[PDB]
Amino acid sequence: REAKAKVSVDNNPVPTSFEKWGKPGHFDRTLARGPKTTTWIWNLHANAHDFDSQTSDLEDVSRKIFSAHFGHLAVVFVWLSGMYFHGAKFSNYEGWLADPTHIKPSAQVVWPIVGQGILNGDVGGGFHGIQITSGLFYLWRASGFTDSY
């Protein structure tokens, strides 16, 4: 995949494995020797993304950063899709779109238990739920969404 570009990659620098998943603290040489004090635990979380304190190679650090960027983008995609699905199968977006001025934008229905069902207040059109303030319904109307599908 050169295409007369400036691209330069390494075809296999890191093998894929699961063994290091069983060694918490593999990235830190001071933590690989195993815990002796409780501080060991805390530092394990403090230096998790501290790639500079894990290796003095700028290239490996840039690679870790790039893959971490990809992972975070996957996380934000998961969150955005969760919001879209909750607007799809758990919201009153259509009943709201049919008459906005007399209904409250609701989403996230609560399971009636231990009394918590009281949080599903009437928002209009017979829908019962938690009124959302993120303004997703207004954004979706601006985008032109008409159907929950």
Partner: protein, 73 residues
Amino acid sequence: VVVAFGTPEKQILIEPVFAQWIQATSGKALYGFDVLLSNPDSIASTTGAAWLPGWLDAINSGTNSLFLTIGPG
């Protein structure tokens, strides 16, 4: 959390039984304990002490700040 969900009936209200009993030992008849100075048939209440009538009258009149009635709060 119990009062919040519109179900205030599930509050854990536990009666201060020991302190109410202690009040009764000083002649407090509101809780119906009939123990020591709250019981007229008790030996400690029939000793002829000039301080018993006024003490019982002040501790059994819910108008002052002497041995205030206590609830679970």
